[PDB]
């Protein structure tokens, strides 16, 4: 069926600047193409139908555009609240399809992360295993590395870490790698240490603990 | 105004099957079309088709053909969607959305979605332990503390601090799933390293799933 092409995926802008993303139908639809924009955690939402026609409600920094099998999407002075997914859908023919999104991503100054170290609650332990949690707070780039050190053991395996999308305060990540072993093997251990290195740091901080 | 409830979150178990509601308000149920779309975590927005409640005239995405059948009922201004024979395929969050009509169309609204799991699995509600504030005097200025969420099933869940209260600072982590097979997140925020033990924090953790609602709170060393 007719394939709608968004390239590229992530496009990266700054506040204030103006971007514009595209939508390659594969046929003339005829300015049948409609634009949401979909915030992480929410729902899709409508910004433009029929191609130009902005949906009421909605701020004038928004714009589209397009004919034949080209049409494109224009915020003339990016603020932090248009972060999220665009998708373009086509209802020229059906079935009516979806591009594959175009997701907005802002670029901002270098940021250093704020490393915490949680240790294994007294509640928590009284059960199973133990969880040790290390948090690196808003930081920017993305790109961050977190090793887990136990007696200067370098652990392997038993991490798992998640990321937050950029914050709307400052458009920062915030990262959480978490631990997890046995009742047993923990106490087994005395230091467990949280090594972050990122581009923002001058050398690598570390955070740890005894018990 | 107009607007669009979805059904609460769903778990079956595969072979089984579901139906999600769409309430309609606002507008006449009958002149606008219902638009349905499936959105899986690495395949962004799937359009399902579309019901005309009033001439229940109906277009399937032949994908979908068979898999879900839609319905509506004009006095309760609510539309269904039901997905058949379910397997993990078919775990998705769901959005219905009102498309155009014949006089009129100036844009769409889209239901809030519904989470749809497919597992043989229990629910298990969440286990809730605290991100215990280190004293973090240690060259900085602030302290963080949080909310350690574990072992919880399926994934609908969510968290706040002194209820919405303070929303200054707070940190949620899309879930992780663990090799029990078992989602867990953490919940974090930073407050003045100061005001500590002059006022505390505590974690709202509810999940519907099963119903549980947690309310601990949060003390230094
Ligand atoms: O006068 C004229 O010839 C032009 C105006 C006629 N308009 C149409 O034919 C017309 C046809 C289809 C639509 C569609 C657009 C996509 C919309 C939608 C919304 C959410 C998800 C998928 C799809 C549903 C809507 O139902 C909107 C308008």
Redesign the pocket.
């Known amino acids: 069926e007719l394939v709608l092409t968004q390239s590229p995926s992530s496009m990266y802008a700054s506040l204030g600047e103006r971007v514009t993303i595209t939508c390659k139908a594969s046929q003339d639809i005829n300015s049948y193409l ?1 634009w949401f924009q979909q915030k992480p955690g929410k729902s899709p939402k ?1 910004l433009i ?1 029929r191609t130009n026609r902005l949906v009421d409600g909605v701020p004038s920094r928004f714009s589209g555009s397009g004919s034949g099998q080209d049409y494109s999407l224009t915020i003339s002075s990016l603020e932090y609240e248009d972060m999220g997914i665009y998708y373009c ?1 086509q ?1 020229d023919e059906f079935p ?1 399809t979806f591009g594959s999104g175009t997701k907005l991503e802002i670029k901002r100054t270098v940021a250093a992360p704020s490393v915490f170290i949680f240790p294994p609650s007294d509640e928590q332990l009284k059960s199973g295993t133990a969880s040790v949690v290390c948090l690196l707070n808003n930081f920017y780039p993305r790109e961050a590395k977190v090793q887990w050190k136990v007696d200067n053991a370098l652990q392997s395996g038993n991490s798992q870490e998640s990321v937050t999308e950029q914050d709307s305060k400052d458009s920062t990540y915030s990262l959480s790698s978490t631990l997890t072993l046995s009742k047993a093997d923990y106490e087994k251990h005395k230091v467990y240490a949280c090594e972050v290195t990122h581009q923002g740091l001058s050398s690598p901080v570390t955070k740890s603990f005894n018990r | 105004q107009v607007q669009l409830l979805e059904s609460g979150a769903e778990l079956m178990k595969p072979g089984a099957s579901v139906k999600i509601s769409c309430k309609a308000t606002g507008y006449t149920f009958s002149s606008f ?1 219902i ?1 349905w ?1 499936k959105q899986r975590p690495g395949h962004g927005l799937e ?1 399902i088709g ?1 019901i005309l409640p009033g001439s229940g005239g109906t277009h399937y995405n032949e994908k979908f053909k068979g898999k879900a059948t839609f319905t509506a009922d004009k006095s309760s201004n609510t539309a269904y969607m039901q997905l058949s024979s379910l397997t993990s395929e078919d775990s998705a969050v769901y959005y219905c ?1 009102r ?2 009509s014949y006089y009129f ?1 100036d844009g ?1 609204y ?1 239901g809030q979605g519904t989470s749809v799991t497919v597992s043989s699995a229990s629910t298990k509600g969440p286990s809730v332990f605290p991100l215990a504030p280190s004293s973090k005097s240690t060259s900085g200025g602030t302290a963080a503390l949080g909310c350690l969420v574990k072992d919880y099933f399926p994934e609908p869940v969510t968290v706040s601090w002194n209820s919405g209260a303070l929303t200054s600072g707070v940190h949620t982590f899309p879930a992780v799933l663990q090799s029990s097979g078992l989602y867990s997140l953490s919940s974090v925020v930073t407050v003045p390293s100061s005001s500590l033990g002059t006022q505390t924090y505590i974690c709202n953790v509810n999940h519907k799933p099963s119903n549980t609602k947690v309310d601990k709170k949060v003390e230094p060393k």
Do not use: S
Request: negative net charge; without cysteine.
């Open positions: 409609n409508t139908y859908l209802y009516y | 079309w638009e779309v359009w579309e959305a498309g155009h169309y769409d889209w």
